[PDB]
RNA sequence: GAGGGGCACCACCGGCCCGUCUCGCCCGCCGCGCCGGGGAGGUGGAGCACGAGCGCACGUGUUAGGACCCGAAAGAUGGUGAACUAUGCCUGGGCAGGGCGAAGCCAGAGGAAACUCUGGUGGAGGUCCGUAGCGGUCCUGACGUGCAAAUCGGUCGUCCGACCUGGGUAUAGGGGCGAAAGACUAAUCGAACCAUCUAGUAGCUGGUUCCCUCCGAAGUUUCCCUCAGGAUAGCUGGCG
RNA sequence: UUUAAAUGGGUAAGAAGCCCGGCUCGCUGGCGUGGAGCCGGGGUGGAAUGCGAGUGCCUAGUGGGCCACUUUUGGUAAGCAGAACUGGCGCUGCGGGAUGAACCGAACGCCGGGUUAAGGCGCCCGAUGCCGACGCUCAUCAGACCCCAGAAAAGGUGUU
RNA sequence: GUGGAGCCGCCGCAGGUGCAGAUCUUGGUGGUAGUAGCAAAUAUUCAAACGAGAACUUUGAAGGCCGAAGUGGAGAAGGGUUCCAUGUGAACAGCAGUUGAACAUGGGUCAGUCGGUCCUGAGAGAUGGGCGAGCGCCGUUCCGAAGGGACGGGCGAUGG
RNA sequence: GGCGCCCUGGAAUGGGUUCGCCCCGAGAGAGGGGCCCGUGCCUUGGAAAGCGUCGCGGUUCCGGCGGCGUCCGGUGAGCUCUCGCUGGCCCUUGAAAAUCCGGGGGAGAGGGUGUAAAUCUCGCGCCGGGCCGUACCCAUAUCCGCAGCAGGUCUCCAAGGUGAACAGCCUCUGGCAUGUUGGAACAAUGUAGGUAAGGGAAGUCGGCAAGCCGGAUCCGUAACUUCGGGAUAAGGAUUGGCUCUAAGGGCUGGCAGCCGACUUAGAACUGGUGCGGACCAGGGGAAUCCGACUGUUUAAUUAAAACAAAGCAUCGCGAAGGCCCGCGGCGGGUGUUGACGCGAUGUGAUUUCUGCCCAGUGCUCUGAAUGUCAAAGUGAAGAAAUUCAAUGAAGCGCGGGUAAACGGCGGGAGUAACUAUGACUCUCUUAAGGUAGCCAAAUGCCUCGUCAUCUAAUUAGUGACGCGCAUGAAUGGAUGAACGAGAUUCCCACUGUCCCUACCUACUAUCCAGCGAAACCACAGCCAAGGGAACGGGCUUGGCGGAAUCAGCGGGGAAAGAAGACCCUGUUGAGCUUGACUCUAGUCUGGCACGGUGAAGAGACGUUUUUUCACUGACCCGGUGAGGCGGGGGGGCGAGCCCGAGGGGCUCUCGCUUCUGGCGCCAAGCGCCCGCCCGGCCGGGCGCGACCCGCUCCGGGGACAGUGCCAGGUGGGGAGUUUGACUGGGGCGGUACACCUGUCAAACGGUAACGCAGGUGUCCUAAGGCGAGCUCAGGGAGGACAGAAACCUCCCGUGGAGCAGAAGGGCAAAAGCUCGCUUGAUCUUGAUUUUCAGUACGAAUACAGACCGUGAAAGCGGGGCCUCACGAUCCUUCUGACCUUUUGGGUUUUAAGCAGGAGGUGUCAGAAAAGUUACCACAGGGAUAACUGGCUUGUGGCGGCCAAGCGUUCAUAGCGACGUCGCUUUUUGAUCCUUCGAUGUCGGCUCUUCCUAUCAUUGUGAAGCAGAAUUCGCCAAGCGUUGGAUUGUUCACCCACUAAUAGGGAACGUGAGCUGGGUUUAGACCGUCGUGAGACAGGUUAGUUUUACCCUACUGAUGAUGUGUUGUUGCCAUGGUAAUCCUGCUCAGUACGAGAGGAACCGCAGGUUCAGACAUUUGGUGUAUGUGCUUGGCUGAGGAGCCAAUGGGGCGAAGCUA
């Protein structure tokens, strides 16, 4: 009769994110006349750190084309960049590390981070620490290019989508063990109120579909349908298969 | 002695009206018909057979209403609470002394070399002993109409850490929050508290207030989701 | 089960009966047959005992019962479970059974005299304080009054 | 006998119509009973003074405790006059009280520079807009003609 | 003090440096500067004030008057605070704004000169600064807890000694009156603190509780190991006081001379072997089970093995997405996000492994493969309502995948040269048959398994074994260091836990002065038996019965607390669960709308359907301060291109920013035009620089998504409700729940029980109807095969056969067999019977009016030879009349009626219905279980009577079959009387009494009694009937001692006497069971045990009545009563006896248990606080003392005491 734990994460009372000491959205600068037709020069000032993100950031000062003003962007730091480096951003930008330029002009098989899934959306895909995407298959008629996401799933996107050349810094992070319960606590204190996950088998029949019984057992099959209602989707939600995995994934 | 007329009422026979049923023939014409009416028998009706009702008052019985009085566990509607406590977040404050001695470093010694050994230095750790703090194992100690609607005395757990804590702030009742004990949410929690619906319902417990006179029971029948209850016949009293 | 009680159950013991003559009928049919109904007429003393009866309306409470002879079912048995007939208790005091729900007598307005019932009469405690009758019995565990509240098989050259 | 201003009989009428009980309701009073009790944190003593009156007030003297993570010195929240003086001893302080945070009368809190005031934090909340039968809610940059100001530069009027 | 500041100059034989590091050709060292903090000192303030001290005036303001002083040094791992310098740790990076300031730019502005402007963050001077808070407490008395409440409640400041220390103990500054009272006494019982001879767990469920060990220095340390640990392992040695010695630093001079720190080591002397002297402070070892650890957890009964955790897996998702919120919006959260991410689960570090199953239940994927399946739409028939038909969404069904999804892992056959088992082979159920491992496990019923080992003795522990009721692999299996306020077993050490208690101390209790309640209370308060609601205080019969009281005490008041939490009932609830009943949010699909423009393709019959592409304008999503969009031309250094002459433009290109941590705006210039200069000077204006036109701001989707509405899926996520009755309590079982036969049943009828013996929910077109002819079961005697049984014949044959089935009744030219016809098993109205209320249904009887059958006819027949074989209202369906009504009147369809058949209610006079609760709640019930008590005694026990036997012989010394009669209430039942507004439920411990059915002790009788020893009876309950191991045990079983180790009762004596082990709440684990919540006298673990001050009883203490008062000395009525058992020597190795063996009485020495006392002796105790020893502190030191809640410790009188 009582609501379950994942149902209470949608109201967002204590399950809202911890966003105070974060710096801002890490977004490419918006497209205008300079990047549709040419390039523009910017210099990165400092490599900073977000709490709760695994990647670092790069704050880059550009020269405003229309007002006399220097205005600061925040980029996802591509790996290998340093402070006091010139960063070039445009259609006619030259393909180096850290330069951001449209995916339709760059060749096939170049490694891409922080790319747009619809044009002008200022960077959505392939942004976690150490991740990247690969471009193949330019279709210069009905201009669409297909990329390869970090999940191995390919996606045909628009050609004028914009993207910084390189891989996201801070990679190899998940190779280290958390190694004790204390350093997992500090990990999620930067992120959310989510960390000590009680098993639903351990709680009571008000609190979960799996709890109860004189023995800790699930009882009911732990693969459930996708059109199950809220408060019943717990466990392996619309699982195509179970058991320890064989092969690679063998389902497109 | 006998005879006669017989009230009311009771029993019986006969008749009458309405519905139906069988059997049968006749009659009438604001128009001759897939019309109207009648007969003789048997049956169904809360009927007729020279009317008794109405209004008013009182008494008894039963029913619907708070319904002889008091009593739930509930359900619903609309509100008030995070001054305790649960968890986030904001901004502050707090934690003696010792023990072990990681990485780094320095010298010396062995050795043909590869390298090894030794002594320092160094001070790491959800590291150990252990104050303040935070807890609350054992005595199954004291207290148990207590100092106290949970306290005390030893003893004990942990004290750089998932640490302890103040004020600010957020989340609210089939909701919240929960390192999960159905824990905690103002001494209230396997669904809070306030007011209303509400005098909710009870075949179930308790109670039910003056005197004398007369009569005086039953615990059995049949039916019931009936078995601690009713209805029905018996038993009773009252009126005639 | 041939036979077959006791106890028991129905019915009859009159005028609403008995008899005679006549009329109706569409029933019955050799028949003025049969049977029903109907009218008129003739004569009342028809077992014992006891009692005044008939009928209608309204109607409360009750719908857990229990007990004892007798007869019975289940049970080793039960102050057990379940029936039959009658009485009682519940609703009921009183005399007695010391005691008591139900045993035995007897049912009850308020009192005086008398007499009894069941039970009794050494003393509690009313009444044997009779010159009561005949026998039986000795217990180092005597006996002592329906229900009823304690005993059996077996044995004694104990006594009759 | 107390009491000090109303009351009753009869014939009809009408009821919030008579108590011993409901772990009844409210109020009062017992017995228990001058009883249980006034036992956590080492401790009091002598003299004096004022007074009707002193184990407890004050003052001196001795002896002790706390022992600087204090029984010491100041604050925050909270309280609200509890602070201070004099008077009082009815009640209250669970013995007493000549004492008090009690009662009675009268005093006391002074700021440019101590804080509030100001700023924003998590967050809270209008307007535009949206939703909604509606009280209203969502929402905080989102679907908004969201600047009322100006170093300036010039015209036009207008004034010392 | 700091500097990641400068200049000179260049370093290697590398140097400078720190406690550590670190720094250097990107400039070290060295030399000379610069800057920042200066909270320190000097000075102004400022000595005039402050304080200390010595005076002197002033009665009263006096912030009186005056003298002198307020001075030199040292030191430090010191404490506290501040400033700084450098490191480390982070999958953790540790706030915003208000304000304030520097810098860059240079639009402007300024006096224009032999004088002063604009300006000034410089030095002084003037004016103003409103509003509100401001006392005090801040806590064992100002706050919260009902209060002056051992509780709670945020901070800062903090001295001397001892010492590692903000420890403990002692003192100074500053506080206080011992915590809401004083006095006297020093009994019990308590609470808190000690101590104890000898023994050392013998106590106990358990070593619970207490005690040991404890600091530091010097040695010395194992198994095991994840190599880090363990580890303060373990095990030793030492420690004082006093003298000394040796070592450990600073600064001044040209290697020496003057001052400072408390450490370390070594030796001597010394004391009654005493030294961490108080204080502070690790008991250790060997093992097993569980959890890796640290963490966390039910505030107020559980701290754990639970939860969490790192690690390991699996799952969903590329944003119009996934998972959630929301009454609502394209509203919110994850998301200031983007697969190294978010969301959803499970297992639980490491190491080592992860077996076999896709049948089931889920989950998931697919081909115009196909079964089923809604609205809308399509077609047909009809006058229409309406009806039918075909087509076919998702889902289901079918097929595939998936077990680190829920989960499951059994049998049965054959098979090896003793037997056994089965490597092997073959199959069933149901897909597979439990692999590696592991085990009587926290998982094994039987079971206290068997076997080793530990003990004198072990239901314990450990190690094995393993067809294992019911082990098993992320339900995770097995190991394994470290760590557990976890569970358990042993060993050492230690001890009053125990033998077995004793004594001392504080605080009480006790008495007094003051002050003073509450629970509770029908009336009350001495018993034995009887009866009684079966356990009286009162009642009956007995015993008996003096005031008034005090300190105790726990037998009784079935003592108080509470309308039993168990159990049952209720047509009372609630929490959860699901393959319950009924729905619901949500979501997946189809339709119609919003919803437009075009093209192409396809399926079926111009008609209809469907698909894919293109468009954009609705609609939607991004982005932006809606900042350059689309077409068109300006420019060749680029193409000079189809050809080629000076060039032409089928086809064309874009542009001006890319070695570097710099700057970039507010227009230059050119052309025109005005007022201003007489063909020249000021101040303004416009354009080109900066192309033109145009209808979305730019991109991305787009007639889809989305939304409104309806139809169908799915939907315990959520809501509502339900969960039969009877019942020797309930459940399970059964159906005695509707019905029929025989009996019970007691000779009319009626009659109960979960009484007995059975039966029914059908069967039958003949097994209904009628007529005719016939005789059955069985037997005898004959007949080819032919027999017990074949068919044929004759005789006998009263029902011994048959009649559909259960019984009972009935029946012979029959009610049975065979045959011939038939449909009366049809239509219709009443009455009667049965059950019964004298209602209904069902069944039946007698008719009547029809139409029929059969028979020659009489007749018989409206179901079955009779007794059973079945079913309301409402609804539905069919039939019946040339019927009645269909609402203003007609016609027609339909609908409603009337009449009677059917489609059901078996809980059968008829609801529509799954669990669980140990998290539980209410109303009740002793109408009703679990406990005692009561009736009963089957059963358990203990006895007799008879005598076939046994006993060499010999029934009865001792036994005794086949029987048979009893007792007892210590067994277990049976029953259900008392108790449900409560009688506290096992065992042990402690303690008193009682019984006898006698184990021992006294006196005896009988043996198959030689003696010794046994055995069986008698009077007899006087007196005894132990110490232990395992176990919660009662019970058991074993070791040992003994005269003997007999059995019982007292509300299964005894919880205001205890304990809490067991059982029996709530947490948790395992096994089996269930889909699940949950269940299991199956196992394991952790789990609040309240009150006497009342009345009596008992125990002690005053006293009361009576004697005139009072005293001394006495008597005894009555009541209590207490002693017991063994051993040794003697008798004696004698009697007796073949021997072996082997008595007793008298006497004598002790002892055991028990009872009464006592302190000479010896132990304990000890606060004579007696005496000296001693640690830290304190009084200036000595001397003498004091404090440390009794500072410790050695001896100790008296007194108590074994
Ligand atoms: Mg978890
Ligand atoms: Mg009689």
Swiss-Prot record:
InterPro entries: NA-bd_OB-fold (IPR012340), Rib_uL2_dom2 (IPR014722), Ribosomal_uL2 (IPR002171), Ribosomal_uL2_arc_euk (IPR023672), Ribosomal_uL2_C (IPR022669), Ribosomal_uL2_CS (IPR022671), Ribosomal_uL2_dom3 (IPR014726), Ribosomal_uL2_RNA-bd_dom (IPR022666). Keywords: Cytoplasm, Hydroxylation, Isopeptide bond, Ribonucleoprotein, Ribosomal protein, RNA-binding, rRNA-binding, Ubl conjugation. It is found in: Cytoplasm. GO terms for molecular function: RNA binding; rRNA binding; structural constituent of ribosome. The keyword Iron-sulfur does not apply. The modification (3S)-3-hydroxyhistidine is found at residue 215. GO terms for cellular component: cytoplasm; cytosol; cytosolic large ribosomal subunit; cytosolic ribosome; focal adhesion; membrane; nucleoplasm; postsynapse. Belongs to the universal ribosomal protein uL2 family. There is a cross-link at residues 41, 148, 233, 249 (Glycyl lysine isopeptide (Lys-Gly) (interchain with G-Cter in SUMO2)). Residues 206-231 are annotated as: Disordered. One of its GO terms (biological process) is translation. Hydroxylated on His-215 by RIOX1. The modification is impaired by hypoxia. Component of the large ribosomal subunit. Interacts with CRY1. This protein can be partially incorporated into E.coli polysomes in vivo, indicating it can replace the endogenous protein. Component of the large ribosomal subunit. The ribosome is a large ribonucleoprotein complex responsible for the synthesis of proteins in the cell. Pfam families: Ribosomal_L2, Ribosomal_L2_C. PANTHER family: LARGE RIBOSOMAL SUBUNIT PROTEIN UL2 (PTHR13691:SF16), RIBOSOMAL PROTEIN L2 (PTHR13691). This is Large ribosomal subunit protein uL2. The keyword Glycoprotein does not apply.
């Amino acid at each position: 009769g009582r609501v379950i734990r994942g149902q209470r994460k949608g109201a967002g009372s204590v399950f809202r994110a911890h966003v105070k000491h974060r710096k801002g959205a890490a977004r490419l600068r918006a497209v205008d006349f300079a990047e549709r037709h040419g390039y523009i020069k910017g210099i990165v000032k400092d490599i900073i750190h977000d709490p709760g993100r695994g990647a670092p950031l790069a704050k880059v000062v550009f020269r405003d084309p229309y007002r006399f003003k220097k205005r600061t962007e925040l980029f996802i730091a591509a790996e290998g960049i340093h402070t006091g480096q010139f960063v070039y951003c445009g259609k006619k930008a030259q393909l180096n590390i850290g330069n951001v330029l449209p995916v339709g002009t760059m060749p096939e098989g170049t490694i891409v981070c922080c790319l747009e899934e619809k044009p002008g959306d200022r960077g959505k895909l392939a942004r976690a620490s150490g991740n990247y995407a690969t471009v193949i298959s330019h279709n210069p008629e009905t201009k669409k290019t297909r990329v390869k996401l970090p999940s191995g799933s390919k996606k045909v996107i628009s050609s004028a989508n914009r993207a910084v050349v390189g891989v996201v810094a801070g990679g190899g992070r998940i190779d280290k063990p958390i190694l004790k319960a204390g350093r997992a606590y500090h990990k999620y204190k930067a992120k959310r109120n989510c960390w000590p996950r009680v098993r639903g088998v351990a709680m009571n029949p008000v609190e979960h579909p799996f709890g109860g019984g004189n023995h800790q057992h699930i009882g009911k099959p732990s693969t459930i349908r996708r059109d199950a209602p809220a408060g019943r989707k717990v466990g392996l939600i619309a699982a195509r298969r179970t058991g320890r995995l064989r092969g690679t994934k063998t389902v497109q």
